[PDB]
Amino acid sequence: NRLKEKYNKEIAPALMTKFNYDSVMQVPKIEKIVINMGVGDAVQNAKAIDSAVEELTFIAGQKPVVTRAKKSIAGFRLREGMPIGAKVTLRGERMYDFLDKLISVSLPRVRDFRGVSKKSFDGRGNYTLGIKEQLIFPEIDYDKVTKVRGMDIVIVTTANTDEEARELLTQVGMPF
Amino acid sequence: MITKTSKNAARLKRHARVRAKLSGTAERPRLNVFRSNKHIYAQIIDDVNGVTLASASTLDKDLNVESTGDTSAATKVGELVAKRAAEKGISDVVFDRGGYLYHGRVKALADAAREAGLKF
Amino acid sequence: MLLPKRVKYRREHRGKMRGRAKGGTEVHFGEFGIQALEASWITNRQIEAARIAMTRYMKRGGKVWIKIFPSKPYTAKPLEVRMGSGKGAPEGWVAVVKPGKVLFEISGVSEEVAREALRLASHKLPIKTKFVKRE
Amino acid sequence: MKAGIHPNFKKATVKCACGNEFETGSVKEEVRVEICSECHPFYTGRQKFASADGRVDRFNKKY
Amino acid sequence: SKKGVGSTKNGRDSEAKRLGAKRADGQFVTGGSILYRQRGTKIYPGENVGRGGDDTLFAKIDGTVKFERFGRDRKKVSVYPV
Amino acid sequence: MRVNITLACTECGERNYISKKNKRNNPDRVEFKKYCPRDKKSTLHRET
RNA sequence: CCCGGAUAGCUCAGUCGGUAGAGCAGGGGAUUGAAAAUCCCCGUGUCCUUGGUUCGAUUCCGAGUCCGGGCACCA
RNA sequence: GCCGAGGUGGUGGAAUUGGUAGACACGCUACCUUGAGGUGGUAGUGCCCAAUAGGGCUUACGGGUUCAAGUCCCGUCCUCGGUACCA
RNA sequence: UGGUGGCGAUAGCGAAGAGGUCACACCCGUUCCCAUACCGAACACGGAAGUUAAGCUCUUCAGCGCCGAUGGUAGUCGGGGGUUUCCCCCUGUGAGAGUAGGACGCCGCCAA
RNA sequence: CUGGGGCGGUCGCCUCCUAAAAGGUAACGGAGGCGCCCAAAGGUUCCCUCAGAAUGGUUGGAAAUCAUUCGCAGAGUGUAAAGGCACAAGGGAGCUUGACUGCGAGACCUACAAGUCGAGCAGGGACGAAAGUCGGGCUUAGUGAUCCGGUGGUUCCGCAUGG
RNA sequence: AGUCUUGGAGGUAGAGCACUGAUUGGACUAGGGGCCCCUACCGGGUUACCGAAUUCAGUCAAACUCCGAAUGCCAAUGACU
């Protein structure tokens, strides 16, 4: 709730004059936040899938979904079906509030966090977060942490170009 | 760069599935429903000749309401089109759920058509 | 041996040689070419002996531009075998050559070479030849 | 919104040890943080320590 | 003497089910008789013809038969009464 | 696997139906509702 | 149609209602100027599964797989 | 010529069932034992990189099919067992 | 202008613009019916702040796609003939390819 | 069966090519299947794209999973093949068993026996609000005569009559 | 029955290379090693040492078709013999 009033009243008028769009409809938004898990433990351990089946729900209460790989892969010793990882999709109000957890709280718990990767855009206006450790925010509760797998987060915007999604995240507060 | 299609074309893909196996013949007209975001519409169409028979809507100067998009607004026009189908008193029609579900205001139109006396 | 690497079928019917050439009816990637004047089969053996006599006379070839390729195979039986009992194993290769087909080319070397160059290859083919310039 | 699947969502009062009070809506109710971003010195422009410490030696004559 | 060769391995064939056109164009065709047999629906049923379960063509009504098109590259059986 | 299966009636006692089943998929006894001609109506049926 | 084999890792036994038994193997022990072969020790078993009689019952009936020996149907 | 079988670590040989081994024995390899031997006793031991982890490579060769192939399917090449008859 | 049909993309993409008071749309929210394997993304429910950017229509243009001649040719039904793995001549038929060109919409029905 | 028989190979079905722009046509002529399988892989209801590529990215690598465009199609079609199919026949969910009994004017095919196709009618159903569909599976294969005895139901006869 | 008449069904001969395969040549190139340089298989330079894709022209088919004749066949329709 805090970021939306910040985004609507402050961030959206700021970038509008910065690149001279002809409407509020041309002012780009950041719609959905999709989070992949993608654990290949099911070849070895089906019980290790249950870790982050339960655990990712504690991050955002929208429960992730069974993601079955749609091609049997013998080089990974994997048949088709056979669930690999989970999928946290998130769009709407809590997702900017999820971003409120990200910038303000999460990132200083990356124990050697610095100016994060600038050129990790797809040439479209979308961004991926390189995270390898899941102990980022005080829910994680180390004594109940047996699995050490991190997390992959995708930023999806309505940015028609790319280099103003560059300038979008700066006004959001993404450090670089 | 997220690109979603229009709702109308998404309606058109699921309207075209309906059009493949029921059509507006003689004395079984295609009683269609259009669902704009500020109104609602109804046409009675014979697809053999391409001739509309009767049509009314919430965008009509008579018997209007305040909401214009309520399910109760569908109850008003759901008998007036059937009153036009009582005006041209054919009263017998294969119903078209035209590109929409049989859930809400579409159901309210057809039930008001049944209660006014259209034979489904 | 200009061998095709992987063919859909080992063996084909032998075809009938009527009509003109579909394409390859005029030299354009070189300036001195050779149209055939009749129609028969041509093997990889009839291209090896062809391509060798091209560069033994020129002594420094610009390019050769071998147009045709042995697409169609052909079979025969092992010797002294009564008729029937299966089409035989594939043995060699066949380039299917209609009359008026540009066979070879000569890239940028003078006429008195080229008049003698394609001469020395015409006696390695079973087909009458003629000498065609670029137009 | 399926019931019986989503855990709850409660308005969190995120507090940092330096006094940075922050508001989200989460599962847990109270979040007490050692170092937030506003407590983190890289968000404070240049951090005080490693910006002045990252120098190479001055081919040290001093002794 | 003779070197005995065998190894046929290919000497089989099915028997063909008899496809193709059956009732000619413009023919007065009674109800319920077949028009055309096809594996894979090449010619769609149009007016007064249904698609069979074995996707052949069977006339619903009596009268004459035509073959118009479905526009781009697609055919149709049209059957009209008298 | 594949076994030929009789699907008899319940309340009447005539067979009227034979189909097949699969052993790993359906090891137990199966049931359906079909049309017995003696019962002259839709009626529950049972594998023998 | 009858009769033969379902336990310990394995090979096998075995009660008339109250429980785990050999051999080989595994693990170690001592023995021996070394070595097997012997000599001890614990090991490990829902006694095939499901219901019933009964106080519970490998025990023991109510319900069935798969390997061998035959009488004998097979258009 | 035709069929029938089979092509492997240094070597001989099983894995011939569908999921990955390249058993097991004999080499070979360092050590232990003997004054040095042979012998005997542990440890590894398919090739090649990583002193480690791991990866590549492969079961005559060549190609398919497979998520897969020592095996499934087919062509070549080698070597065995059987046949090449009647006038 | 909207809704809804038929006509082989000549209805296509592609780029260049214009338009919106209503209209149509995005757009604003889930208290409710219903919902997404997870969600108001869509589907439902309701609302009307500002929005012509998107789609929606309205225009231009031949860059691809598409349509498509005429002329001749290939092949060829029959007619004979000749050196007979093929080939020539006559009556008749006649493509594809290649172009000239056409075309970046026509015809209905109802509402305003 | 047999380009003399011998041995070797094959024997029926399904698809393609030969086949000569209808159908059919042979060769010990070219290529591969089948003696099933499925309780959902059918029935309807409603839902919605695919294959790779290109990027962006922990472990992740050529190739797991996430987005992200460009993609009428390269895939997926229980399985060979041809013919179709992106309005689903491809892909999900719910509910259910029409994998219904009695039929069927009419045809295609055919020497015969077989084999195909189906409007529609009835009784009872399933699904859906309804219209309407459903007489198994995307079509074409997945198997066979009669005689024979076994098996369950039978207003059928039963050797003087009753059984 | 034959001819003329309009109406089709059908995918060979031909032709095309848009799908399928095969295949020529140039430009271009991811990437790959190699002369190997600087040198933790790590920092990058380099060639005609190859090269997938890429597009430009180029051929080719019994089991390749966006195409597609003559005829031949089932027709209706009248006419004539």
Swiss-Prot record, chain A:
Source superkingdom:
Bacteria
UniProt entry tagged with the keyword Ribosomal protein: yes
Report the PROSITE patterns cross-referenced here: RIBOSOMAL_L5 (PS00358)
Among InterPro entries, the record links this protein to:
Ribosomal_uL5, Ribosomal_uL5_bac-type, Ribosomal_uL5_C, Ribosomal_uL5_CS, Ribosomal_uL5_dom_sf, Ribosomal_uL5_N
Keywords noted in UniProt: Ribonucleoprotein, Ribosomal protein, RNA-binding, rRNA-binding, tRNA-binding
Pfam families xref list = Ribosomal_L5 (PF00281), Ribosomal_L5_C (PF00673)
What GO biological process terms does the UniProt entry carry, in alphabetical order?
translation
Query: Single GO cellular component annotation?
Result: cytosolic large ribosomal subunit
UniProt lists the family membership as follows: Belongs to the universal ribosomal protein uL5 family.
Q: What does this protein do?
A: This is one of the proteins that bind and probably mediate the attachment of the 5S RNA into the large ribosomal subunit, where it forms part of the central protuberance. In the 70S ribosome it contacts protein S13 of the 30S subunit (bridge B1b), connecting the 2 subunits; this bridge is implicated in subunit movement. Contacts the P site tRNA; the 5S rRNA and some of its associated proteins might help stabilize positioning of ribosome-bound tRNAs.
What is known about its subunit structure? Answer: Part of the 50S ribosomal subunit. Part of the 5S rRNA/L5/L18/L25 subcomplex. Contacts the 5S rRNA and the P site tRNA. Forms a bridge to the 30S subunit in the 70S ribosome. Interacts with VmlR. In stalled ribosomes contacts MutS2.
NCBIfam families found in the cross-reference section: PRK00010.1
Protein name in UniProt: Large ribosomal subunit protein uL5
Give the classification, highest ranks: Bacteria, Bacillati, Bacillota, Bacilli, Bacillales
The gene designation is rplE
From Swiss-Prot, chain B:
Give the encoding gene's name.
rplR
Report if keyword Hydrolase is assigned: no
- Superkingdom assignment: Bacteria
Family according to the record: Belongs to the universal ribosomal protein uL18 family.
Spell out the Pfam families in the cross-references: Ribosomal_L18p
- Summarize the protein's role: This is one of the proteins that bind and probably mediate the attachment of the 5S RNA into the large ribosomal subunit, where it forms part of the central protuberance. Required for correct processing of both the 5' and 3' ends of 5S rRNA precursor, which is does in conjunction with ribonuclease M5 (RNase M5, rnmV). Possibly folds the 5S rRNA precursor into the correct conformation, thus acting as a chaperone.
Its subunit composition reads:
Part of the 50S ribosomal subunit. Part of the 5S rRNA/L5/L18/L25 subcomplex. Contacts the 23S rRNA and 5S rRNA. Required for catalysis of RNase M5.
Annotated keywords: Chaperone, Ribonucleoprotein, Ribosomal protein, RNA-binding, rRNA processing, rRNA-binding
A Gene Ontology cellular component where this protein is annotated is: cytosolic large ribosomal subunit
HAMAP family recorded:
Ribosomal_uL18_B
SUPFAM superfamilies recorded for this chain? Translational machinery components
- From the UniProt record, give one GO term of the biological process aspect: translation
**Matching InterPro entries:** Ribosomal_uL18_bac-type, Ribosomal_uL18_bac/euk
Q: Name one GO molecular function term.
A: 5S rRNA binding
**NCBIfam families with a match to the protein in the record:** L18_bact
Query: Which protein are we looking at?
Result: Large ribosomal subunit protein uL18
Curated annotation (Swiss-Prot), chain E:
- Encoded by which gene? rpmA
Membrane-spanning residues? none
Output the PANTHER family linked to this UniProt entry: LARGE RIBOSOMAL SUBUNIT PROTEIN BL27M (PTHR15893:SF0), RIBOSOMAL PROTEIN L27 (PTHR15893)
What the entry lists under InterPro entries is as follows: Ribosomal_bL27, Ribosomal_bL27_CS
| Record keywords | Ribonucleoprotein, Ribosomal protein
Protein name as annotated: Large ribosomal subunit protein bL27
Q: Which residues form a coiled coil?
A: none
Q: What happens when the gene is disrupted?
A: No effect on sporulation at 37 degrees Celsius, however sporulation decreases at 47 degrees Celsius.
Q: Which SUPFAM superfamilies match?
A: Ribosomal L27 protein-like (SSF110324)
Swiss-Prot record, chain F:
Gene Ontology BP, a term: translation
Output the Gene3D superfamilies linked to this UniProt entry: Ribosomal protein L33 (2.20.28.120)
Got a GO cellular component term for this one? cytoplasm
Q: Pfam families under this entry?
A: Ribosomal_L33
Q: Which UniProt keywords apply?
A: Ribonucleoprotein, Ribosomal protein
Which parts form a coiled-coil structure per UniProt? none
Task: Please note every region of biased composition (Basic and acidic residues).
Answer: 25-48
- The keyword DNA-binding belongs to this UniProt entry's keyword annotation: no
Tell me the SUPFAM superfamilies matching this sequence: Zn-binding ribosomal proteins (SSF57829)
InterPro entries with a match to the protein in the record = Ribosomal_bL33 (IPR001705), Ribosomal_bL33_CS (IPR018264), Ribosomal_bL33_sf (IPR038584), Ribosomal_zn-bd (IPR011332)
Task: Tell me the segments the record calls region Disordered.
Answer: 20-48
Please give the Gene Ontology molecular function terms for this protein.
Answer: structural constituent of ribosome
NCBIfam families attached to this UniProt entry: PRK00504.1 (NF001764), PRK00595.1 (NF001860), rpmG_bact (TIGR01023)
Family, per entry: Belongs to the bacterial ribosomal protein bL33 family.
How is the subunit organization of this protein annotated in UniProt? Part of the 50S ribosomal subunit. Interacts with VmlR.
Name of the protein in its database record: Large ribosomal subunit protein bL33A
**Chain's gene name:** rpmGA
